[PDB]
CSV table of N, CA and C and ligand atoms in Angstrom, one decimal:
chain,number,residue,atom,x,y,z
A,1,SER,N,43.8,36.6,14.6
A,1,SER,CA,43.1,36.8,13.3
A,1,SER,C,43.8,36.0,12.2
A,2,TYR,N,43.6,34.7,12.2
A,2,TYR,CA,44.4,33.7,11.4
A,2,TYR,C,43.7,33.2,10.2
A,3,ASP,N,42.9,34.0,9.6
A,3,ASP,CA,42.2,33.7,8.3
A,3,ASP,C,43.2,33.9,7.1
A,4,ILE,N,43.6,32.8,6.5
A,4,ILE,CA,44.6,32.8,5.4
A,4,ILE,C,44.0,33.5,4.1
A,5,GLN,N,42.7,33.5,4.0
A,5,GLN,CA,42.0,34.0,2.8
A,5,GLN,C,41.5,35.5,2.9
A,6,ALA,N,41.6,36.1,4.1
A,6,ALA,CA,41.0,37.4,4.4
A,6,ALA,C,41.6,38.5,3.5
A,7,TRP,N,42.8,38.4,3.1
A,7,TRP,CA,43.5,39.4,2.3
A,7,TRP,C,42.8,39.8,1.1
A,8,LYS,N,42.0,38.8,0.5
A,8,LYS,CA,41.5,39.1,-0.9
A,8,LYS,C,40.4,40.2,-0.8
A,9,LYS,N,39.4,40.0,0.1
A,9,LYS,CA,38.3,41.0,0.2
A,9,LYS,C,39.0,42.3,0.8
A,10,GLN,N,40.0,42.2,1.7
A,10,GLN,CA,40.6,43.5,2.2
A,10,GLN,C,41.3,44.2,1.0
A,11,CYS,N,41.9,43.5,0.0
A,11,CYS,CA,42.4,44.2,-1.2
A,11,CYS,C,41.3,44.7,-2.1
A,12,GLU,N,40.2,44.0,-2.2
A,12,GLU,CA,39.1,44.5,-3.1
A,12,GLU,C,38.6,45.8,-2.5
A,13,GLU,N,38.4,45.9,-1.2
A,13,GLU,CA,38.0,47.1,-0.4
A,13,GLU,C,39.0,48.2,-0.7
A,14,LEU,N,40.3,48.0,-0.5
A,14,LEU,CA,41.3,49.0,-0.7
A,14,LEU,C,41.3,49.5,-2.2
A,15,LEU,N,41.1,48.6,-3.2
A,15,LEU,CA,41.1,49.1,-4.6
A,15,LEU,C,39.8,49.9,-4.8
A,16,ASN,N,38.7,49.6,-4.1
A,16,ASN,CA,37.5,50.5,-4.2
A,16,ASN,C,37.9,51.9,-3.7
A,17,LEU,N,38.5,52.0,-2.5
A,17,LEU,CA,39.0,53.3,-2.0
A,17,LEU,C,39.9,54.0,-3.0
A,18,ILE,N,40.8,53.3,-3.6
A,18,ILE,CA,41.8,53.9,-4.6
A,18,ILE,C,41.0,54.5,-5.8
A,19,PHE,N,40.0,53.7,-6.3
A,19,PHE,CA,39.2,54.2,-7.4
A,19,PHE,C,38.4,55.5,-7.0
A,20,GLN,N,38.0,55.7,-5.7
A,20,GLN,CA,37.3,56.9,-5.3
A,20,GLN,C,38.2,58.1,-5.3
A,21,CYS,N,39.5,57.9,-5.0
A,21,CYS,CA,40.5,58.9,-4.9
A,21,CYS,C,40.7,59.6,-6.3
A,22,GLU,N,40.5,61.0,-6.3
A,22,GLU,CA,40.8,61.7,-7.6
A,22,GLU,C,42.2,61.5,-8.0
A,23,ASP,N,43.1,61.2,-7.1
A,23,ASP,CA,44.6,61.0,-7.4
A,23,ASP,C,44.8,59.7,-8.2
A,24,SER,N,43.8,58.8,-8.3
A,24,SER,CA,44.0,57.5,-9.1
A,24,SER,C,43.7,57.7,-10.6
A,25,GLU,N,43.1,58.9,-11.0
A,25,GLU,CA,42.6,59.0,-12.3
A,25,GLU,C,43.6,58.6,-13.4
A,26,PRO,N,44.9,59.1,-13.4
A,26,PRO,CA,45.8,58.7,-14.4
A,26,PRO,C,46.2,57.2,-14.5
A,27,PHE,N,45.9,56.5,-13.4
A,27,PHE,CA,46.4,55.1,-13.2
A,27,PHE,C,45.3,54.1,-13.3
A,28,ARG,N,44.1,54.5,-13.7
A,28,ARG,CA,42.8,53.6,-13.6
A,28,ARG,C,42.7,52.7,-14.8
A,29,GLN,N,43.5,52.9,-15.9
A,29,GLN,CA,43.5,52.2,-17.1
A,29,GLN,C,44.9,52.2,-17.7
A,30,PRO,N,45.2,51.2,-18.6
A,30,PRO,CA,46.5,51.1,-19.2
A,30,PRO,C,46.8,52.5,-19.9
A,31,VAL,N,48.1,52.9,-19.8
A,31,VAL,CA,48.6,54.2,-20.5
A,31,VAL,C,48.2,54.0,-22.0
A,32,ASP,N,47.8,55.1,-22.7
A,32,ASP,CA,47.5,55.2,-24.1
A,32,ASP,C,48.8,55.7,-24.8
A,33,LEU,N,49.2,54.9,-25.8
A,33,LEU,CA,50.5,55.2,-26.6
A,33,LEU,C,50.2,56.3,-27.6
A,34,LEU,N,49.0,56.6,-28.0
A,34,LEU,CA,48.7,57.6,-29.0
A,34,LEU,C,49.1,59.0,-28.4
A,35,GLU,N,48.9,59.2,-27.1
A,35,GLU,CA,49.3,60.5,-26.4
A,35,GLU,C,50.8,60.4,-26.0
A,36,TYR,N,51.3,59.2,-25.7
A,36,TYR,CA,52.6,58.9,-25.2
A,36,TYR,C,53.3,57.8,-26.0
A,37,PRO,N,53.6,58.1,-27.3
A,37,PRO,CA,54.2,57.1,-28.2
A,37,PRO,C,55.6,56.6,-27.9
A,38,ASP,N,56.3,57.3,-27.0
A,38,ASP,CA,57.6,56.9,-26.5
A,38,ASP,C,57.5,55.9,-25.3
A,39,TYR,N,56.2,55.8,-24.7
A,39,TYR,CA,56.1,55.1,-23.4
A,39,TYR,C,56.8,53.8,-23.3
A,40,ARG,N,56.7,52.9,-24.3
A,40,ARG,CA,57.3,51.6,-24.2
A,40,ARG,C,58.8,51.6,-24.5
A,41,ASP,N,59.3,52.7,-24.9
A,41,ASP,CA,60.8,52.8,-25.0
A,41,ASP,C,61.4,53.0,-23.6
A,42,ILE,N,60.6,53.5,-22.7
A,42,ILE,CA,61.0,53.8,-21.3
A,42,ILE,C,60.5,52.6,-20.3
A,43,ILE,N,59.3,52.2,-20.5
A,43,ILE,CA,58.6,51.3,-19.5
A,43,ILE,C,58.5,49.9,-20.2
A,44,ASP,N,59.2,48.9,-19.5
A,44,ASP,CA,59.2,47.5,-20.0
A,44,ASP,C,57.9,46.8,-19.6
A,45,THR,N,57.2,47.1,-18.5
A,45,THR,CA,56.1,46.4,-18.0
A,45,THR,C,55.0,47.4,-17.6
A,46,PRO,N,54.1,47.8,-18.5
A,46,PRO,CA,52.9,48.6,-18.1
A,46,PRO,C,52.1,48.0,-17.0
A,47,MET,N,51.5,48.8,-16.1
A,47,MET,CA,50.6,48.3,-15.1
A,47,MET,C,49.6,49.4,-14.7
A,48,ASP,N,48.4,49.0,-14.3
A,48,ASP,CA,47.4,50.0,-14.0
A,48,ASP,C,46.4,49.3,-13.0
A,49,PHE,N,45.5,50.1,-12.3
A,49,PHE,CA,44.7,49.5,-11.3
A,49,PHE,C,43.6,48.6,-11.8
A,50,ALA,N,43.1,48.9,-13.0
A,50,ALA,CA,42.1,48.0,-13.7
A,50,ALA,C,42.7,46.6,-13.9
A,51,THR,N,43.9,46.6,-14.4
A,51,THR,CA,44.6,45.3,-14.5
A,51,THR,C,44.8,44.6,-13.2
A,52,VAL,N,45.2,45.3,-12.1
A,52,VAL,CA,45.3,44.7,-10.8
A,52,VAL,C,44.0,44.1,-10.3
A,53,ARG,N,42.9,44.9,-10.4
A,53,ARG,CA,41.6,44.4,-10.0
A,53,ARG,C,41.1,43.2,-10.8
A,54,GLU,N,41.3,43.2,-12.1
A,54,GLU,CA,41.0,42.0,-12.9
A,54,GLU,C,41.8,40.8,-12.5
A,55,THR,N,43.1,41.0,-12.3
A,55,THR,CA,44.0,39.8,-11.9
A,55,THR,C,43.5,39.3,-10.6
A,56,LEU,N,43.1,40.1,-9.6
A,56,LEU,CA,42.5,39.7,-8.3
A,56,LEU,C,41.3,38.9,-8.5
A,57,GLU,N,40.3,39.5,-9.3
A,57,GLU,CA,39.0,38.8,-9.5
A,57,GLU,C,39.1,37.5,-10.3
A,58,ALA,N,40.1,37.4,-11.2
A,58,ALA,CA,40.3,36.1,-11.9
A,58,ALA,C,40.8,35.0,-11.0
A,59,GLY,N,41.3,35.4,-9.8
A,59,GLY,CA,41.9,34.3,-9.0
A,59,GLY,C,43.3,34.1,-9.4
A,60,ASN,N,44.0,35.1,-9.9
A,60,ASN,CA,45.4,35.0,-10.4
A,60,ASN,C,46.5,35.6,-9.6
A,61,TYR,N,46.1,36.1,-8.3
A,61,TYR,CA,47.1,36.4,-7.3
A,61,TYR,C,47.0,35.2,-6.2
A,62,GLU,N,48.1,34.7,-5.8
A,62,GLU,CA,48.2,33.7,-4.7
A,62,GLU,C,48.3,34.4,-3.3
A,63,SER,N,48.8,35.6,-3.2
A,63,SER,CA,49.1,36.3,-2.0
A,63,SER,C,49.0,37.8,-2.2
A,64,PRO,N,48.8,38.5,-1.0
A,64,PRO,CA,48.8,40.0,-1.2
A,64,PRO,C,50.1,40.6,-1.5
A,65,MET,N,51.2,39.9,-1.3
A,65,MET,CA,52.6,40.3,-1.7
A,65,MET,C,52.6,40.5,-3.2
A,66,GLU,N,52.0,39.5,-3.9
A,66,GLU,CA,52.0,39.6,-5.4
A,66,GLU,C,51.3,40.9,-5.9
A,67,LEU,N,50.1,41.1,-5.3
A,67,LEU,CA,49.3,42.3,-5.6
A,67,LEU,C,50.1,43.6,-5.3
A,68,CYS,N,50.7,43.6,-4.2
A,68,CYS,CA,51.5,44.8,-3.7
A,68,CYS,C,52.7,45.0,-4.7
A,69,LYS,N,53.3,44.0,-5.3
A,69,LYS,CA,54.4,44.1,-6.2
A,69,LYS,C,53.8,44.8,-7.5
A,70,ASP,N,52.6,44.4,-8.0
A,70,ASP,CA,52.0,45.1,-9.2
A,70,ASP,C,51.7,46.5,-8.9
A,71,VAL,N,51.1,46.8,-7.7
A,71,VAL,CA,50.7,48.2,-7.4
A,71,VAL,C,52.0,49.1,-7.3
A,72,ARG,N,53.0,48.5,-6.7
A,72,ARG,CA,54.3,49.3,-6.6
A,72,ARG,C,54.9,49.5,-8.0
A,73,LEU,N,54.6,48.6,-9.0
A,73,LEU,CA,55.1,48.8,-10.4
A,73,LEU,C,54.3,50.0,-11.0
A,74,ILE,N,53.1,50.2,-10.7
A,74,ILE,CA,52.3,51.4,-11.2
A,74,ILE,C,53.1,52.7,-10.8
A,75,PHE,N,53.5,52.7,-9.6
A,75,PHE,CA,54.2,53.9,-9.0
A,75,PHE,C,55.6,54.0,-9.6
A,76,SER,N,56.4,52.9,-9.7
A,76,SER,CA,57.8,53.1,-10.2
A,76,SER,C,57.7,53.4,-11.7
A,77,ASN,N,56.7,52.9,-12.4
A,77,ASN,CA,56.5,53.3,-13.9
A,77,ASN,C,56.3,54.8,-13.9
A,78,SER,N,55.5,55.4,-13.1
A,78,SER,CA,55.2,56.9,-13.1
A,78,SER,C,56.5,57.6,-12.8
A,79,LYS,N,57.3,57.2,-11.9
A,79,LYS,CA,58.6,57.8,-11.4
A,79,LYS,C,59.6,57.8,-12.5
A,80,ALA,N,59.6,56.7,-13.4
A,80,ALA,CA,60.6,56.6,-14.5
A,80,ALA,C,60.1,57.4,-15.7
A,81,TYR,N,58.8,57.6,-15.9
A,81,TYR,CA,58.3,58.3,-17.1
A,81,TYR,C,58.3,59.8,-16.9
A,82,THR,N,58.3,60.3,-15.6
A,82,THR,CA,58.2,61.8,-15.3
A,82,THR,C,59.4,62.5,-15.8
A,83,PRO,N,59.3,63.7,-16.5
A,83,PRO,CA,60.4,64.5,-16.8
A,83,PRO,C,60.9,65.3,-15.6
A,84,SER,N,60.1,65.5,-14.6
A,84,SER,CA,60.5,66.2,-13.4
A,84,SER,C,59.7,65.7,-12.1
A,85,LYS,N,60.3,66.0,-11.0
A,85,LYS,CA,59.7,65.8,-9.7
A,85,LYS,C,58.4,66.7,-9.6
A,86,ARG,N,58.4,67.8,-10.2
A,86,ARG,CA,57.4,68.9,-10.2
A,86,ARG,C,56.4,68.6,-11.3
A,87,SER,N,56.0,67.3,-11.5
A,87,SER,CA,55.0,66.9,-12.5
A,87,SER,C,53.6,66.7,-11.7
A,88,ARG,N,52.5,67.1,-12.3
A,88,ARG,CA,51.2,66.9,-11.7
A,88,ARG,C,51.0,65.4,-11.5
A,89,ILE,N,51.1,64.6,-12.6
A,89,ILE,CA,50.8,63.2,-12.6
A,89,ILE,C,51.8,62.4,-11.6
A,90,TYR,N,53.0,62.8,-11.6
A,90,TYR,CA,54.0,62.2,-10.6
A,90,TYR,C,53.6,62.5,-9.2
A,91,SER,N,53.2,63.8,-8.9
A,91,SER,CA,52.8,64.2,-7.6
A,91,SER,C,51.5,63.5,-7.2
A,92,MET,N,50.6,63.2,-8.1
A,92,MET,CA,49.4,62.4,-7.8
A,92,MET,C,49.8,60.9,-7.5
A,93,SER,N,50.8,60.4,-8.2
A,93,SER,CA,51.3,59.0,-7.9
A,93,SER,C,51.9,59.0,-6.5
A,94,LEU,N,52.6,60.0,-6.0
A,94,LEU,CA,53.3,60.0,-4.7
A,94,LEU,C,52.3,60.1,-3.6
A,95,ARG,N,51.2,60.9,-3.7
A,95,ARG,CA,50.1,60.9,-2.6
A,95,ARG,C,49.4,59.5,-2.6
A,96,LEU,N,49.1,59.0,-3.8
A,96,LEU,CA,48.4,57.7,-3.9
A,96,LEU,C,49.2,56.6,-3.3
A,97,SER,N,50.5,56.6,-3.5
A,97,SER,CA,51.4,55.6,-3.0
A,97,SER,C,51.4,55.6,-1.5
A,98,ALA,N,51.5,56.9,-0.9
A,98,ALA,CA,51.5,57.0,0.6
A,98,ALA,C,50.2,56.4,1.2
A,99,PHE,N,49.1,56.7,0.5
A,99,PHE,CA,47.8,56.2,0.9
A,99,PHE,C,47.7,54.6,0.9
A,100,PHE,N,48.2,54.1,-0.3
A,100,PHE,CA,48.3,52.6,-0.5
A,100,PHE,C,49.1,52.0,0.6
A,101,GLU,N,50.3,52.5,0.8
A,101,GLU,CA,51.3,51.9,1.8
A,101,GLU,C,50.7,51.9,3.2
A,102,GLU,N,50.0,53.0,3.6
A,102,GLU,CA,49.4,53.1,4.9
A,102,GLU,C,48.4,52.0,5.1
A,103,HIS,N,47.6,51.7,4.1
A,103,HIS,CA,46.5,50.7,4.2
A,103,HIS,C,46.9,49.2,3.9
A,104,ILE,N,47.9,49.0,3.1
A,104,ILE,CA,48.4,47.6,2.8
A,104,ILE,C,49.2,47.0,3.9
A,105,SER,N,49.8,47.8,4.8
A,105,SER,CA,50.7,47.2,5.8
A,105,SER,C,50.0,46.2,6.7
A,106,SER,N,48.7,46.5,7.2
A,106,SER,CA,48.0,45.5,8.0
A,106,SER,C,47.6,44.3,7.2
A,107,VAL,N,47.3,44.5,6.0
A,107,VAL,CA,46.8,43.3,5.1
A,107,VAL,C,48.0,42.4,5.0
A,108,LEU,N,49.2,42.8,4.7
A,108,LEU,CA,50.4,42.0,4.6
A,108,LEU,C,50.7,41.3,6.0
A,109,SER,N,50.8,42.1,7.1
A,109,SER,CA,51.1,41.6,8.4
A,109,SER,C,50.1,40.5,8.8
A,110,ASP,N,48.8,40.7,8.6
A,110,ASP,CA,47.8,39.7,9.0
A,110,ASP,C,48.0,38.4,8.2
A,111,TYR,N,48.2,38.5,6.9
A,111,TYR,CA,48.4,37.4,6.0
A,111,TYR,C,49.6,36.6,6.5
A,112,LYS,N,50.7,37.3,6.7
A,112,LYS,CA,51.9,36.5,7.0
A,112,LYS,C,51.8,35.9,8.4
A,113,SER,N,51.2,36.5,9.3
A,113,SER,CA,50.9,36.0,10.7
A,113,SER,C,50.0,34.7,10.5
A,114,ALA,N,49.0,34.7,9.7
A,114,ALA,CA,48.0,33.6,9.4
A,114,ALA,C,48.8,32.4,8.9
A,115,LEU,N,49.7,32.7,7.9
A,115,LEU,CA,50.5,31.6,7.3
A,115,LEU,C,51.4,31.0,8.4
A,116,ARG,N,52.0,31.8,9.3
A,116,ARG,CA,52.9,31.3,10.3
A,116,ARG,C,52.0,30.5,11.3
A,117,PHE,N,50.8,30.9,11.6
A,117,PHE,CA,50.0,30.1,12.5
A,117,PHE,C,49.6,28.7,11.9
A,118,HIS,N,49.4,28.7,10.6
A,118,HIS,CA,49.0,27.5,9.9
A,118,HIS,C,50.2,26.5,10.0
A,119,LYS,N,51.4,26.9,10.0
A,119,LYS,CA,52.7,26.1,10.1
A,119,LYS,C,53.3,26.2,11.5
A,120,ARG,N,52.5,26.3,12.5
A,120,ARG,CA,53.0,26.5,13.9
A,120,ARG,C,53.4,25.1,14.5
A,121,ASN,N,52.8,24.0,14.1
A,121,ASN,CA,53.1,22.7,14.7
A,121,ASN,C,54.0,21.8,13.8
B,201,ZQ5,C1,43.8,56.6,-20.7
B,201,ZQ5,C2,43.7,57.5,-19.5
B,201,ZQ5,C3,45.0,57.8,-18.8
B,201,ZQ5,C4,46.0,56.7,-18.9
B,201,ZQ5,N1,47.3,57.1,-18.3
B,201,ZQ5,C5,48.1,57.9,-18.9
B,201,ZQ5,O1,47.9,58.4,-20.0
B,201,ZQ5,N2,49.2,58.3,-18.1
B,201,ZQ5,C6,49.4,58.1,-16.7
B,201,ZQ5,C7,50.7,57.5,-16.4
B,201,ZQ5,N3,51.8,58.3,-17.0
B,201,ZQ5,C8,52.6,58.9,-16.1
B,201,ZQ5,O2,52.8,58.4,-15.0
B,201,ZQ5,C9,53.2,60.2,-16.3
B,201,ZQ5,C10,52.9,61.1,-17.3
B,201,ZQ5,C11,53.7,62.3,-17.0
B,201,ZQ5,C12,54.5,62.2,-15.9
B,201,ZQ5,S1,54.5,60.7,-15.3
B,201,ZQ5,C13,51.7,58.5,-18.4
B,201,ZQ5,C14,50.3,59.1,-18.7
């Protein structure tokens, strides 16, 4: 399965599934500072799923590794902003992360295999 471009539609598909998940609701749009005015004192680089989807559709990811780095930043930002492990929004981030990781693993493997096949000779 050596299609070097297949990861893009696979990532679009996976973002559609993440948008259907009720657990994505807090992460679907950039954090609002009016409710969280301290947010940028804690978080250096905000990230959200709408920004990831727009970056993909603009043609501004070169690989699924780059997309994966931004999605992982959504989750590390939640983990750094939470005052406790027993946070509703943090617990939503941890279920959504498990779902994402379960689905992205084949996307990454197939892409990396395709690149290795391209440079086989
Ligand atoms: C505009 C619609 C929602 C935008 N998101 C939003 O406001 N937040 C989700 C991300 N976040 C957190 O990860 C945590 C809050 C408490 C524990 S972690 C801060 C709040």
